[PDB]
Design a protein around this nucleic acid. Structure first.
Lengths: 50, 50, 178
DNA sequence: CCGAGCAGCATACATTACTTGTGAGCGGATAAC
DNA sequence: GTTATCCGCTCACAATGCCACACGCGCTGCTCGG
């Protein structure tokens, strides 16, 4: 009643959210320093950390 | 008995105590300790109960 | 009249300039254009215009650190520390910073002035060390630097020409290792 | 203008995470003169 | 008050042997480069 199983999807989305929060921080600081309206949402984020 | 052993007396003293405890050696302001405690819980991002 | 004493912050390996940019941006955020008046990252330039590395190179007085002209208030303390990528302060006990003294301030200021006035070729040669020659006329020779020169920058170098040693004026670009 | 090396970077943060069992030095409470 | 006394606090420091197999082993934006 207190020990739950954690399947593949759940752990996978956990690691995904972990890898996502760091790119969130990166894109936040790049949106901060970077221009407001010159960009296209395809380079302030990097698929590398995900 | 706890309130006896409880050294603090005021809410802001609670904030500064928890703030020092979390990470010692830091200048405890109102905003610093308050935001630290409001990030330890009561924050959709830094915390979640699943 | 509490002057904004200078201070120093430990950055990461090679983010010092970017850290200073982001710090100025956080200043423009919090409008603390008074307390965080000046922020500086010094540098130097070695100008060897031949032999691989071409025409310039940039050094730092001391890497990993950034210099600011903040003031002492806990709010400004965090505002300095609440920037993208910095470690803590560099000074007295953590949470109680200490200022780089005014003597050191003017010292580093004079260093900055000297490096800003004269872009000067460093990586020099010391009198009495053997060295090859990459010159056209004197290809694949090797001699000892008999006397070094900086403004003329032409390396009085002794080398075996017609038997006995002779001094030559082979310029910097015509000087190999060491 | 991007390809190929480099120098010092807990990626900057909040990372992080229940008992493991035992000894040993240590700092705040304690009995006595 | 002080001087020695003691008790909980925190940290160091150990966890059977082999065998086999497997997998992996920085990087990254600054720097040297044309």
């Amino acid at each position: 009643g207190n020990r739950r199983i954690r399947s593949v999807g759940e752990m996978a989305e956990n690691q995904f959210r972990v890898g996502l929060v760091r790119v969130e921080r990166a894109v936040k600081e790049r949106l901060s320093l970077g221009d407001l309206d010159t960009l296209m949402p395809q380079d302030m984020i990097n698929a590398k950390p995900i | 008995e706890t309130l006896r052993v409880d050294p603090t007396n005021d809410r802001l003293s609670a904030l500064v105590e928890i703030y020092r405890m979390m990470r010692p050696g830091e200048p405890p302001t109102r905003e610093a300790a308050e935001s630290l405690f409001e990030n330890l819980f009561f924050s959709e991002d830094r915390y979640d109960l699943s | 009249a509490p002057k904004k004493r200078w201070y120093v912050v430990q950055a990461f390996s090679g983010f010092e300039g970017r850290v200073a940019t982001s710090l100025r941006e956080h200043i423009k955020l919090h409008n603390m254009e008074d307390l965080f008046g000046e922020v500086m990252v010094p540098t130097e330039e070695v100008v060897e215009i031949r032999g691989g590395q071409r025409r310039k190179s940039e050094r730092k007085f001391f890497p990993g650190y950034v210099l600011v002209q903040m003031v002492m208030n806990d709010a400004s303390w965090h505002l300095v520390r609440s920037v993208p990528r910095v470690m803590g302060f560099i000074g007295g006990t953590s949470d109680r910073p200490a200022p780089i003294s005014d003597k050191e301030v003017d010292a580093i200021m004079n260093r900055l002035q000297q490096v800003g006035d004269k872009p000067r070729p460093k990586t020099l040669f010391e009198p009495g060390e053997m060295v090859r020659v990459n010159d056209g006329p004197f290809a694949d020779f090797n001699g000892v630097v008999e006397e070094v020169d900086y403004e003329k920058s032409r390396l009085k170098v002794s080398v075996s020409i017609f038997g006995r040693a002779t001094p030559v004026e082979l310029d910097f670009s015509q000087v190999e290792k060491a």
